[PDB]
Scaffold this active site. Structure first.
Site, PDB file in Angstrom:
ATOM      1  N   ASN A  99       0.813  -1.209   0.000  1.00  0.00           N
ATOM      2  CA  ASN A  99       0.000   0.000   0.000  1.00  0.00           C
ATOM      3  C   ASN A  99       0.850   1.264   0.000  1.00  0.00           C
ATOM      4  O   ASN A  99       0.424   2.319  -0.479  1.00  0.00           O
ATOM      5  CB  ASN A  99      -0.890   0.018   1.246  1.00  0.00           C
ATOM      6  N   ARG A 194      -0.357 -12.253   3.053  1.00  0.00           N
ATOM      7  CA  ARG A 194      -1.156 -11.481   3.984  1.00  0.00           C
ATOM      8  C   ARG A 194      -1.048 -10.124   3.302  1.00  0.00           C
ATOM      9  O   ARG A 194       0.062  -9.627   3.098  1.00  0.00           O
ATOM     10  CB  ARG A 194      -0.500 -11.373   5.360  1.00  0.00           C
ATOM     11  N   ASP A 196      -1.070  -6.588   3.725  1.00  0.00           N
ATOM     12  CA  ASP A 196      -1.003  -5.556   4.748  1.00  0.00           C
ATOM     13  C   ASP A 196      -1.793  -4.301   4.375  1.00  0.00           C
ATOM     14  O   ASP A 196      -1.842  -3.914   3.208  1.00  0.00           O
ATOM     15  CB  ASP A 196       0.464  -5.188   4.988  1.00  0.00           C
ATOM     16  N   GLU A 232      -5.642  -7.847   5.485  1.00  0.00           N
ATOM     17  CA  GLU A 232      -5.762  -7.227   6.791  1.00  0.00           C
ATOM     18  C   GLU A 232      -6.717  -6.047   6.730  1.00  0.00           C
ATOM     19  O   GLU A 232      -6.385  -5.015   6.204  1.00  0.00           O
ATOM     20  CB  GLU A 232      -4.414  -6.737   7.335  1.00  0.00           C
ATOM     21  N   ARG A 336      -4.723 -18.930  12.787  1.00  0.00           N
ATOM     22  CA  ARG A 336      -3.351 -18.458  12.824  1.00  0.00           C
ATOM     23  C   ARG A 336      -2.934 -18.296  14.275  1.00  0.00           C
ATOM     24  O   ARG A 336      -3.585 -17.634  15.049  1.00  0.00           O
ATOM     25  CB  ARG A 336      -3.166 -17.121  12.095  1.00  0.00           C
TER      26      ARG A 336
HETATM   27 CA    CA Z   1      -3.693   3.719  -0.105  1.00  0.00          CA
HETATM   28 CL    CL Z   2      -3.032  -9.445  10.656  1.00  0.00          CL
END
Ligand code: CA
Ligand code: CL
Ligand SMILES: OC[C@H]1O[C@H](O[C@H]2[C@H](O)[C@@H](O)[C@@H](O[C@H]3[C@H](O)[C@@H](O)[C@@H](O)O[C@@H]3CO)O[C@@H]2CO)[C@H](O)[C@@H](O)[C@@H]1O
Ligand SMILES: OC[C@H]1O[C@H](O[C@H]2[C@H](O)[C@@H](O)[C@@H](O)O[C@@H]2CO)[C@H](O)[C@@H](O)[C@@H]1O
Ligand code: BGC
Ligand code: PCA
Length: 495
Positions: A99, A194, A196, A232, A336
């Protein structure tokens, strides 16, 4: 949506800040024989080397480039780890920080884990390469350029999360550079990612990136396999952005899970274990097959992220083991398990001033994970995944995989029990008095080793023994003073 784990393996463990060489060894010496499905590794791409404070764990969430060069190791060590783990049937899941890049106030220079040059001020990351027009400066509409209001879905996606330079994910060039990085990882052998800060990316931009991904490495995965994706997204209600907006891309982290389970186990806010009878969507959670569940994660175990005073961690070991045990025994979601390191936690007016402390280290160099004779870890690595009570529940989940939630019992307070088909049964006592009762276990008659207090080792039990009679009933006696107030038995702990 599929984790792509070996059939029969149902959990992944987050070996937070572990070095690649240590994870490789861990796969071979422990994870494979103990039935763990895979490992979530810390971001493997080059990040900013932060010196004040001294090498905080969070510096790894400030990318400088996509070179696989970090404090965990270099590319050869990373490839070595993925290969060795896959070779023993244990998968690797990468924490993809896509991101953003680094904080916008970080000084320009070569203070990065691989020495790559970068200049946040000029939006220059030549090691990728990214330049000014690859960020959302002109797109963001807030006065500060940072996210100021989570009630505005637009700025949450187009502005800087705590000042982190926001990548222009609508651009095909940017989407392609990210895909290039992820495909490098997929071809090496990773099973999934994952994603983020997914809440900070538009579902449509994530889709465009995932569309560019390769199928998993055909040496270890069936042809046509797709990477496992868990996003997430912290959705506790009260905000415009919902976890469901990301279901088309893969699974989503269900943060409501640990927050409520923590509250229930701590017996706060009038909650109690008997209420867990309808645990799952009944509690307002997302669909089971879209959820990635956990008791605590690397952020909230130290007050970061959504935090929450109810979150249970290794610091509250007794209640933690019970929460993790309940999670691993219950069919809801994909599980997890957290594996942490100890840090000098110090609260000053409700805030842990050392919530930034990075992994055990010798002047910045991460310490190896040493294994003690009793199989616990040294060098301040907590290794919750090696705690007998947790490790044995990891296998419990494997043993009962597919079996229905059944034979529920509760005393209207905090003494509950339930089974998974005819493969396992678990009993909890979180009330302030002894749990002494004969219950229907749904299991075949015989002598079972309680896997919480001990282990089944060549014909014997090293802990408590439970006797199931012909009618499937067994007596359980758990004192409220027990250091582990719960018992679990399953098909493979039967003598
Ligand atoms: Ca963004
Ligand atoms: Cl997480
Ligand atoms: O050529 C010198 C130049 O190299 C690097 O520029 C890169 C840009 O930073 C990067 O954004 C990308 O540019 C593409 C645009 O993003 C895309 O929208 C479209 O216009 O195509 C462009 C070219 O592919 O790639 C360039 C070239 O690598 C470096 O970052 C600059 O500092 C340097 O001046
Ligand atoms: O789906 C990805 C896409 O979402 C956003 O698009 C906005 C658009 O810019 C607005 O004008 C308005 O139409 O709402 C849309 C979302 O519903 C992002 O702005 C865009 O960059 C992104 O690629
Ligand atoms: O280090 C391993 C141990 O850590 C503890 O503090 C847990 O409470 C124990 O049950 C566990 O065996
Ligand atoms: C699930 O995790 C992956 C990504 C979405 C899909 O179809 N498979």
């Amino acid at each position: 949506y599929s984790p792509n784990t070996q059939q029969g393996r149902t959990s992944i463990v987050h070996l937070f800040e572990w070095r690649w060489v240590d994870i490789a060894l861990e796969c071979e010496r422990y994870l494979a024989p103990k039935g763990f499905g895979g490992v979530q590794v810390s971001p493997p791409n080059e990040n900013v080397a932060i010196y004040n404070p001294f090498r905080p764990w969070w510096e790894r969430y400030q990318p400088v480039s996509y070179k696989l060069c970090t404090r965990s190791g270099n590319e050869d060590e990373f490839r070595n780890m993925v290969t060795r783990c896959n070779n023993v049937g244990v998968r690797i899941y990468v924490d993809a920080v896509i991101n953003h890049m680094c904080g916008n106030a970080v000084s320009a220079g070569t203070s990065s884990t691989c020495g790559s040059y970068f200049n946040p001020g000029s939006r220059d990351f030549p090691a990728v390469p990214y330049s000014g027009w690859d960020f959302n400066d002109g797109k963001c509409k807030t006065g500060s350029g940072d996210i100021e209001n989570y009630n505005d879905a637009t700025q949450v996606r187009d502005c800087r999360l705590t000042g982190l330079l926001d990548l222009a994910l609508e651009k095909d060039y940017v989407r392609s550079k990210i895909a290039e990085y992820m495909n490098h990882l997929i071809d090496i052998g990773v099973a999934g990612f994952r994603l983020d800060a997914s809440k900070h990316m538009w579902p449509g931009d994530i889709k465009a990136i995932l569309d560019k991904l390769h199928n998993l490495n055909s040496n270890w995965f069936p042809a046509g396999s797709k990477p496992f994706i868990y996003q997430e997204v912290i959705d506790l209600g009260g905000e415009p952005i919902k976890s469901s907006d990301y279901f088309g891309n893969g699974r989503v982290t269900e943060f409501k899970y640990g927050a409520k389970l923590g509250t229930v186990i701590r017996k706060w806010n009038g909650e109690k274990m008997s209420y867990l009878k309808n645990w799952g969507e009944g509690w307002g959670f997302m669909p089971s097959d879209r959820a990635l569940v956990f008791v605590d994660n690397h952020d909230n175990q130290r007050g970061h992220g959504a935090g929450g005073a109810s979150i249970l961690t290794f610091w509250d070991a007794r209640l933690y083991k019970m929460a993790v045990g309940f999670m691993l025994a219950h069919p809801y979601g994909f599980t997890r398990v957290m594996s942490s390191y100890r840090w000098p936690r110090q609260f000053q007016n409700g805030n842990d001033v050392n919530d930034w402390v990075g992994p055990p280290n010798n002047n910045g160099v991460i310490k190896e994970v040493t294994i003690n004779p009793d199989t616990t870890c040294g060098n301040d690595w907590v290794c919750e995944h090696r705690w007998r009570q947790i490790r044995n529940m990891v296998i419990f989940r494997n043993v009962v995989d597919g079996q229905p939630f059944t034979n529920w019992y509760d005393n209207g307070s905090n003494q509950v029990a339930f089974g998974r088909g005819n493969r396992g049964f678990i009993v909890f006592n979180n009330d302030d008095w002894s749990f002494s009762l004969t219950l229907q276990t749904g299991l075949p008659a015989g002598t079972y080793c309680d896997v919480i207090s001990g282990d089944k080792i060549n014909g014997n039990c090293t802990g408590i023994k439970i006797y199931v009679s012909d009618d499937g009933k067994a007596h359980f006696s758990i004192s409220n003073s027990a250091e582990d107030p719960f018992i679990a038995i399953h098909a493979e702990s039967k003598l």
